[PDB]
Design a protein around this ligand. Sequence first.
Ligand SMILES: CCCCCCCCCCCCCCCC(=O)O
Ligand SMILES: CCCCCCCCCCCCCCCC(=O)O
Lengths: 129, 129
Amino acid sequence: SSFSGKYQLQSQENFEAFMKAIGLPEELIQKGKDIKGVSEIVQNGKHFKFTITAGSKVIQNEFTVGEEAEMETMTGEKVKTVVQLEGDNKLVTTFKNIKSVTELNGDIITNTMTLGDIVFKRISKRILE
Amino acid sequence: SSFSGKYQLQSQENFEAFMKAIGLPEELIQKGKDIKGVSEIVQNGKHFKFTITAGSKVIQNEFTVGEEAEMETMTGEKVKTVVQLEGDNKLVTTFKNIKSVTELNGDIITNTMTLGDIVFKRISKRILE
Ligand SMILES: CCCCCCCCCCCCCCCC(=O)O
Ligand SMILES: CCCCCCCCCCCCCCCC(=O)O
């Protein structure tokens, strides 16, 4: 019902392949590929504040679902996109050629980003505080 | 008696001045100055592993107190230094013209980095898992 929490990355698949596909340099990818950090979400109804840690980068994004917003991506590009809430537990959007689904089941977020044949999946667990 | 934990940045002083002094690109200073994320320490005796969130960057470092080590700074530069334990609750390192003191007070960690007349101070709080 609420996405709010601090989420510890537990495991991921295809980090290197996805970051290569979007244009990041190999040297940066290899430096970040094994980091398992903590991302944070604060949800207030349709409003979301994200402090995402992925690889060696921390990205802070904010949106209201259903409203267009500029989302900073791993390349540094700020993309214009609309994120929708499906049900109470799935955030969906598409930007460039990437389909993104952020799904909350209990205390586990599964984030799936699909770019052609590459399915980049991150599993993170809410720190219960 | 253990530094181990995940710590949420609560407040900080003179981020912009310190990052300017060490030469961080201005675009990264402006992006990173308001980000308050989670850093992790794993201590095993004199050995420490760090996953540090500072601004828009995540930095991993690892060393044994009392032994020379090579640590990655906020600019990405690698420096060789020996980290000491002071008074059983302070990690103290001096590299180039910076003195860094990481002090543990219960659930609070205070990182104080002194560079000439600038004191960059971070106060973080243990996440209770
Ligand atoms: C345009 C959207 C932002 C894209 C940023 C790319 C970094 C990977 C995104 C995964 C974060 C999704 C939130 C779940 C928590 C997590 O997996 O850290
Ligand atoms: C050897 C230099 C360390 C990395 C340089 C980044 C500047 C900030 C370092 C602060 C790390 C201290 C660890 C405790 C938690 C924190 O304050 O984030």
